[PDB]
Amino acid sequence: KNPKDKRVGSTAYRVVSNGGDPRLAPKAKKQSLNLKQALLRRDRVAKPRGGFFV
């Protein structure tokens, strides 16, 4: 990932970074996706997944 900033306390020293999304595709906002899934299953609950298992 990206290097975290080094603050002197007054200012901040960070490194620019755009070497992540080169020509492939942008990574999603996990938050936004979970929001969508929330809006889908607003209140409702899942059934048991499969069968006889710990």
Partner 1 sequence: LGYVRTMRNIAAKELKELEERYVLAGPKKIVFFEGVEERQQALEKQKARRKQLVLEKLARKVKAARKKLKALADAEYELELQQAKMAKTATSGGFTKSGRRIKVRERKR
Partner 2 sequence: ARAKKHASGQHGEIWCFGVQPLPAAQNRKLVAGTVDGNLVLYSIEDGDLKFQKTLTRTPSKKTKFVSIAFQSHNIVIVGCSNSTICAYDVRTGTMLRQMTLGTDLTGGSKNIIVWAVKCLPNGDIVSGDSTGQVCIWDGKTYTQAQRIQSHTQDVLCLSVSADGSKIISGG
> 37 is in the binding site of which of partner 2, RNA, partner 1, none (Cβ under 5 to 8 A by kind)?
none
Which of 27, 1, 2, 33 lies closest to 16, judged by CA? 2
- Residue type, position 16, single letter: V
23 binds, among partner 1, RNA, partner 2, none (CB under 5 to 8 A by kind): partner 2
Give the x/- contact pattern for partner 2 in 20-49, rule: CB under 8 A. -x-xxxx--x--x--xx--xx-xxx-----
Whether residue 3 contacts residue 16, with contact meaning beta carbons closer than 8 Å, is answered with no
Which residue bears the tokens 């609950």? 45
Instruction: Please give the residue ranges that form the binding site for RNA (CB under 7 A).
Output: 1, 3-4, 6, 31, 35, 38-39, 42-43
